[PDB]
């Protein structure tokens, strides 16, 4: 399914933008994949 893969990309980046709207910056350099995808034991969000 190609429509579902475009939903998964647009859906996951909305969850990341919610963390970027809690702060006052949507700038890409301030938010690496280490911020979102590191597990909660290391201090990250634990996003799958």
């Amino acid at each position: 399914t190609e429509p579902l893969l475009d939903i998964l990309v647009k859906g996951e980046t909305r969850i990341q933008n919610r963390v970027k709207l809690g702060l006052n910056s949507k700038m890409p350099t301030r938010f690496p994949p280490a911020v979102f995808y590191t597990p909660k034991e290391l201090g990250g969000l634990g996003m799958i």
Binding site: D6, V9, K10, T13
Partner: peptide, 27 residues
Amino acid sequence: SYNGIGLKSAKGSSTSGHVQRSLASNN
């Protein structure tokens, strides 16, 4: 080049729109 593949734009897509040819599909 845009040979019928890719996106109409990368604005509302939440991607970059970067298209690369599948090296796996050759024969």
